[PDB]
Structure formats: C-alpha cells, structure tokens
Amino acid sequence: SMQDPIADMLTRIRNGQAANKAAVTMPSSKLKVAIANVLKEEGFIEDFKVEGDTKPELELTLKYFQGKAVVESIQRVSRPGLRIYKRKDELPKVMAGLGIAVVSTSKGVMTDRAARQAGLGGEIICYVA
Amino acid sequence: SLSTEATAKIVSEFGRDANDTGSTEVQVALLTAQINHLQGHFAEHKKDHHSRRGLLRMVSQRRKLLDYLKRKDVARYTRLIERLGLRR
Amino acid sequence: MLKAGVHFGHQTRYWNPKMKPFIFGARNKVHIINLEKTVPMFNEALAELNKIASRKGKILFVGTKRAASEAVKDAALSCDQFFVNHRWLGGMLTNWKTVRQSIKRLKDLETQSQDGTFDKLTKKEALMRTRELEKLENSLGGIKDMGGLPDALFVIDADHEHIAIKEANNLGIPVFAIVDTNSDPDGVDFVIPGNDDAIRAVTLYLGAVAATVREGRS
RNA sequence: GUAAAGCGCACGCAGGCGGUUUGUUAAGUCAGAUGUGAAAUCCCCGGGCUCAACCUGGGAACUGCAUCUGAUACUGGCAAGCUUGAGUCUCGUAGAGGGGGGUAGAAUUCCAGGUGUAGCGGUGAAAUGCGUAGAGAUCUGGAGGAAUACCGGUGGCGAAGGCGGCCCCCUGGACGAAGACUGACGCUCAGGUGCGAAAGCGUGGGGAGCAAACAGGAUUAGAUACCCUGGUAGUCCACGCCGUAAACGAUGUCGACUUGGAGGUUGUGCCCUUGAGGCGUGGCUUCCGGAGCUAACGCGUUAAGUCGACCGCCUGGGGAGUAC
Ligand SMILES: [Mg+2]
Ligand SMILES: [Mg+2]
Ligand SMILES: [Mg+2]
Ligand SMILES: [Mg+2]
Ligand SMILES: [Mg+2]
Ligand SMILES: [Mg+2]
Ligand SMILES: [Mg+2]
Ligand SMILES: [Mg+2]
Ligand SMILES: [Mg+2]
C-alpha cells in the first residue's frame, strides 16, 4: 500500500488464494522479494519473478495441493505503530512448528527455525501456516 | 479560477527554467495570486461560503508547500517569501 | 472435424463465472465451449463408466427435460440400466427406503393386466387403478429394476436435474453430468462442458455413453 | 447497520503513521561480554528432623538498568536521487454548488367598475360564515406577495445541512485526455477554527397563500382534539444570535486486494463513423446477487468480505442525557 507495502504483500497473496487465483502481482521491494524468496524454498509458492528496471513489479505464483489451497494461513504481526522485536529465545513457532514465521535478522530475512539455528534474533515479519 | 495570460505568465517568473508549471517556487506563487485576488471578491457577498472552502483549500495547500521548501532548501524559502510579500 | 461439431456453444450471456476455463471464447451473443478442453473430458469420464461398468454396477441417466425424456431410454432402458426421464421424486436416492415402497404397488400393479387378474372389480375400477401405472410406470417405471442405490450417476443437464445431483453427493454416488455455460459444475465430480440442449448433442453423447457401458463388463 | 456504541460536516496545529533506490550512520533492534539486580520467598536437583509441615547446599531465575565490542535485514537520522502517491500547467465536459442583481409567465387574495340575481361556501351530514347595503358566477383595469407546472428521472451538484423558472455579474469543486512540470511536498487528526434543516431570539422591513395561539360552528358520554369558518406570531428580506434533528446509509476518513448480471448519468479513443447506432477505456450512481462475513435480517468490488493507518465511541435496565 501507500503506508504498509509489506502488509499488502500478504493480503494480496491470501486474497489471491481464496479466489483460487493462479498468480498475484504488485509493486516490488527489497524486503518484499526478500520475503517472497523465503516462501519459495519453504514450498509455499511455485516460483516468482519481476519486471522493470525502473518500474519493478513482483510476480508470484499461488499454490495448492488438492481441492483446497496450500497457504491457508498468512497474517502479519510487526506492523507500524505496533512493531515487534523478539530475541533468539522468544521467536514464535507457528502451528506447533509446521507453519513458518518470517523474521528479519542482522544476517537477512529468515524463518523461526532459520534464525534460531543461527542463534540470533530480529524483527518478526509475519506468520505463515 | 484564473486567466491564462496570468497563470502562464507568472509561471515564467518563478520557474527556475522554462514551462516548469510544477516547480514549488512556481505553483506556490501561483496560489497567492488567486488568493489575493479572491480576497477582493470575498470582501463582497461574504455569505458565499462554498467558495471560501476552496479559498481555504489553496491557502492551507499553499502552506503545505512552504513547509516543504523549508525542508528541502532553507534559502529558496526565505528567497521566495519576499518576492511574494508573504508572512505579513 | 469429428462428431463433436454439434455442441459448439449455448446459453447466452447469462453464463456462470465458474464455467470459464471451458469457454472457447464468447462470440455472436453467446460464447463457445472450448472443445480442446472438452476432448479429455470426452473420454476421461467415459473411461470411468467403462471401468465401473465392468464391475457390474449401476448407472442412472437423469433427463427430466422433454427434449431428452422420450430420447433417453434407448440409451438407458434398451442398454438395460437405470434412468429417470421425469419429475425426479424427492428422495429416490436418499429416502429410497420409503420410496421403494411405491415401486412395489407399481410392480404388483403391472401383474394385474398380466393375467386375468385385470378383469377384477367394476370396469371403472380398473380405470382408476390403471391411472396409477401411468404415473408409477413413468416416474419409476425406469428405475424399478434398482434394488439398491447405484454406484455412479450420469445426469444430462446439471441445472434442471438439480435436486437429482444433490442427493447424490450426499450418499457418495459419483456423478457424471454434461453441464453447460449457465450450469453449476461445482456439484459434478466429472464435468462434461457441452451443450446441455441441442437435440443432436443429447442423443450422440447419451447413446455414446451406453456404448462404453454396454461392453464395459467385457 | 438494527443489540450499548461513527462526533451533524469540514479544515487543520500538536501527536501517530509513511512510496521506491543507493550510500552512510548505528539510535531503536539483535549477538557476545562486564557490572548490578541483597538475603529470604518461587522453581529444579539433593540433603536433616522416624514422615510431613519445617530446616537446608548448589543452581535456576530475578523477564530490568547501565557499559563495552560487534551485526546492519527491518525502523529511525543524514546525503543524493527516482516516479507510480500527492500536486501544478494546458484544453475540454456536465452540473438545482455558492453569493449578488435583474426579469417572465401561470395562479391566489385584495381594490375599483360592468353584466347579472338568490344563492354561495362547507361537511358524512350540518352549522358558524358570506349574500337583496347585491354575494357567488362572469368580464375589464389595478395593487401585492410567495413559489416557479410541464421538462423531472430509479437524474444531477454539494463535506454536511442542502440546492429547481429565464438572464447577467463574482466565485468553488468534480471529471476526462494527449500530454508537459514538481518530486513523497502524503494519510489521519485530541484540542482549535469554521460551516449547521426547521422551530426559536433581537433590530428594522414586508406580509398573497398557509398557519402554533386564540374565537366561533360541529362531533362526542365528555372533545381544552381530529372536521368546518376565521385567524396572530411565524413562514419572506436584511443583518446579528441559537447550535439541535430519526442532522440516517441509524454504516468515520484514507489506501490496496477479491466471481458476476442488468441499468442510469457524464468524458474520451476507436469502427464501411454509412445508423438509432457497434467495440472498448475513465468518473459518479441504481437494482439483483457468488465466495465470504452475519445472531438473524441481511451486506456483498459504492462490502457489513480480506487487510493496513489514524481518529471518535460502547461496557445491564430504570433513575438520567437528569441533578450539581
Ligand atoms: Mg432501539
Ligand atoms: Mg443502538
Ligand atoms: Mg456521519
Ligand atoms: Mg535474591
Ligand atoms: Mg534506512
Ligand atoms: Mg456525492
Ligand atoms: Mg429559520
Ligand atoms: Mg424574526
Ligand atoms: Mg445485494
């Protein structure tokens, strides 16, 4: 959005899923693609690309196993006016461990397990189940 | 609103170049005119509120621009407020 | 270039947002049903019928629609199976329990004319009793041979035979319906995007169904 | 939304929040470490009173504050930018947007005069009332005030309240399109300022119709009413005040997403533009309705669906939006 560009990413992804869409598109961003990269390895998204050397536009591909979709849970937490910063011993564990939790570390964007395995903390980004 | 022979006129007096109808120095100054000119209009009628709403608009809108200049080039601010006899 | 050149399109702009990936491309008022997205469905469905027919199962062809009633038996009755070309009763798939009861008085009603047991009671009486056959032998006459719920249901238009399909997905009886632009294929587990109408469309595929089913059981 | 709850509506200071890129900083933040965080409680493991309560060793914890050494993804600061947000310019378009001043035609009432004559008016009936001092009706001339049939629409404009005859003058906003320009200059906004139907208030005007009060007639058991005959404030104007309404979509403003169908109104591109016309592409707006949401009704791309930023508000009924 014009105020919360990251929160929009999640919404556009979840809104697409519900509508059984194929691919979601929206303006890119260092953090955005960075986040989009994680869900990739996590198998939450098929692939992802962008267009524009001056006018970048993210391109994500939704995913679904059977009748229902894959990403059946995606919400934010550390939003503006109410940001969240956890330690290496406070990091959340989405769905008892199954779901992932994106968190920006001094090393870069990671997941609840990722950063933990490292032994460092960062500003939580969102919960993906 | 404003006459072309005036709008397109002033633009060529504050623009740091040519046909720069965007330049704050320009737009901002362009606002004072339609404002000062209307003050003579509002002197009469008075009860005409729906027109003052727009008047106030361009006024605050003008200020929103002045604050910007101060936050982009201190000089340009004090360098323009004089040419327009602003601040009062 | 094959026989599949008769059900190109149907049902004007009324359509149904759901039935889209099967639309060749709207043109001249109504749209078209992408046959290239129909070819797989053309057999994929039949394959299962052919497969299930070998299991000596059951198949009920639903087509209450006039332009399909009289012209449906030859594909079901002749092929010896199950069909309902009339007002689909309420429960002939769920409340079958009590419904079958109606079938009995129908069967025993038949036997009346069978032998001399028809010349019983006033000549008027026979008439009052014979009427029941008209209704019975019609609304059930083509399902009487069903001594238990089927194993798969193949319905023509997915719209008209609405209730029919409903009860099905509530009993676990697979459904092979030839939907259409204004149809709601979400209730069909084996969609066949074709002209729900067209006197020729119905016959060809309908008869084509019994074809695979006929020798389905080898 | 209807249960208690969106301020009547705007503008906007403080405050909160802030599109995209690179460098930089290292404040937030994260990592390590050093202090300190009294002991005792609590907790874990383990000891002694025959057990327990109790007593007790060590640790764990004390989620904090500070300091030092780092890490630089994100937030923040600084520098230089970028253009899609926002804005400026150009040229068009529609409009009951506003303020001022004119002006026209229909009708009412009244004044005068002509014709003409015993009724008119009113109600469910009636009666009050008006009529032989000549009404009513009719026709001619005149005075005056208020509102603008038809077009008028499921229409349009406005922040809200609201805004309809035609003409001129001063003026605001909205939208489209080729574009050109500025370069995050933005969103929200307690307090604050301003706008606010009608009724009402002050001074001075005006006053046709209508009409609280008031007065007759009728109804009725009664009728301080509904009905009828009258009628004052008021309704109208100026200027100042009062700020409320079921000030209602009973639904705060801003932005991004999310199947469809039929229609309205206004801009623009295009099509043998040969046409009423046909195909798109924007603004605003009706009705139906899917997913979803909902306690249900229902809402449903103009959301009451999925989200984000800021603000107002609710916490059982009565007492009470009352007392002080
Ligand atoms: Mg209520
Ligand atoms: Mg309420
Ligand atoms: Mg409101
Ligand atoms: Mg201690
Ligand atoms: Mg930074
Ligand atoms: Mg509006
Ligand atoms: Mg008033
Ligand atoms: Mg007065
Ligand atoms: Mg609806």
Q: What is the DSSP string of chain C?
A: --TT-S-S--S-TT--TTS-TTB----SSS--B-GGGTHHHHHHHHHHHHHHHTTT---EEE--SHHHHTTTHHHHTTTTSEEE-S---TTSSSSHHHHHHHHHHHHHHHHHHHSGGGS-S-HHHHHHHHHHHHHHHHHTTTTTT-SS--S-EEES-TTTTHHHHHHHHHHT--B-----TTS-GGG-SS-----S--HHHHHHHHHHHHHHHHTTT-
Please tell me the distance from the alpha carbon of residue C169 to that of residue C185, in angstroms, as a whole number.
13
Instruction: Give me the CA B40–C1' D265 separation in Å, rounded.
Output: 37
Runs of H (alpha helix) within B1-88: 4-14, 24-43, 52-70, 74-80
By CB atoms closer than 10 A (0-12, 13-18, 19+), residue A124 is buried
Burial class (CB in 10 A: 0-12, 13-18, 19+), B39: exposed
What six digits make up the tokens of A56?
A: 């970048």
Helix, strand, coil percentages for chain A (3-state, nearest 5): 30, 30, 40
C182 to C11, C30, C186, C198: CA distances (angstroms): 6, 11, 12, 15
The segment(s) of chain A belonging to CATH 3.30.1490.10 are 72-129
Residue A54, nucleotide of least CA–C1' distance: D82
How many domains would you assign to chain B?
1
User: Tell me: domain A72-129, CATH 3.30.1490.10, correct?
Assistant: yes
From the C1' of D63, which residue's alpha carbon is nearest? A90
**Does residue A26 reach within 7 angstroms of strand D, measured from its CB?**
yes
CA distance A1 to C204: 55
For residue B10, give the amino acid letter. Answer: I
Structure tokens at A86: 């956890």
- Range of the structural domain that residue B1 is part of: 1-88
Helix (H, G, I), strand (E, B) or coil at A109: strand
Residues 6+ apart with CB under 8 A from A70: A17, A43, A44, A62, A63, A64
**C64 dihedral zone (left: phi>0; alpha: psi -120 to 50; beta):** alpha
DSSP state of A97: G
The structure tokens 């391109």 sit at: A59
CA distance linking residue A122 with residue A71, whole number of Å? 24
Task: Kindly report the backbone phi and psi dihedral angles of residue A66, in degrees, each rounded to the nearest multiple of 5, phi listed first.
Answer: -110, -135
How far apart (Å, rounded) are the C-alpha atoms in residues C63 and C67? 9
Compute the distance from residue C190 Cα to the ligand 8 centre, in Å: 80
Q: Which nucleotide is nearest to A56 (CA to C1')?
A: D20
CB C82 within 8 A of CB C150: yes
CB atoms within 10 A of CB B2: 15
Among candidates C159, C179, C138, which has minimal Cα distance to C7? C179
Buried-state track C110-141, b at ≥16 Cβ within 10 A, e below 16: eebeeeeeeeeeeeeeeeebeeeeeebeebbb
Q: Which strands, in side-by-side order, build the sheet including A48-51?
A: A23-27, A57-61, A48-51
* Strand D and A123 CB separated by under 7 Å: yes
Q: Using N-to-C axis directions, what is the helix angle for B52-70 and B24-43, rounded to 10°? A: 150
Q: Which residue reads 């606002």 in tokens?
A: B31
A2 touches strand D (CB under 7 A): yes
Calculate how far, in angstroms, residue C209's C-alpha sits from the geometric centre of ligand 7. 82
- Chain D positions within 7 A of any protein Cβ atom are 10-13, 16-22, 28-32, 70-75, 82-85, 87-91, 97-100, 158-161, 170-173, 180-187, 194-196, 239-240, 254-262, 290-291, 305-310
Residue showing tokens 């007096």: B13
> Where is A108: in which H helix or E strand?
strand A108-111
Please report, rounded to whole angstroms, the spatial distance between the CA atom of protein residue C102 and the C1' atom of nucleotide D152.
64
| The two structure tokens encoding residue A21 | 């869409």
Which residue matches tokens 């509002």?
B42
Entry field: residues in chain C: 218
Residue type, C122: T
Distance of B29 CA from D312 C1′ (whole Å):
37
Q: Tell me the HSE value of A35 on the side-chain side, using a 13 A CA sphere.
A: 27
Angle at C97 between CA C94 and CA C102, to 5 degrees: 110
CA of A50 to C1' of D225 (A): 80
Q: Is the CB of B57 under 7 A from strand D?
A: yes
Count Cα atoms within 13 angstroms, Cβ side, for C148. Answer: 2
The residue length of chain A stands at 129
Q: Is residue B18 exposed (0-12), middle (13-18) or buried (19+ Cβ within 10 Å)?
A: exposed
Q: Which amino acid makes up residue A117?
A: Q
Q: Tell me which amino acid residue C84 is.
A: V
Of A83, A79, A100, A82, the residue nearest A91 (C-alpha)? A100
Backbone angles phi, psi at A111, to 5 degrees: -120, 165
Alpha-carbon distance of C90 to C167, in angstroms, equals 9
CA dist C153 and C81 (Å) reads: 11
Query: What separation in Å is there between the alpha carbon of C174 and the centre of ligand 1?
Result: 51
Q: Is strand D less than 7 A from the beta carbon of B38?
A: yes
- Torsion-angle region of B19 (φ positive above 0: left; ψ -120 to 50: alpha; else: beta): left
Pairing assessment for the beta strands C60-62 and A122-128 based on DSSP bridges: unpaired
The whole-angstrom separation of Cα C39 and Cα B84 is 77
Task: Note the resolution in Å, 1 decimal.
Answer: 3.5
Written out in words, the top-level CATH class of the domain with range A1-71 is: alpha beta
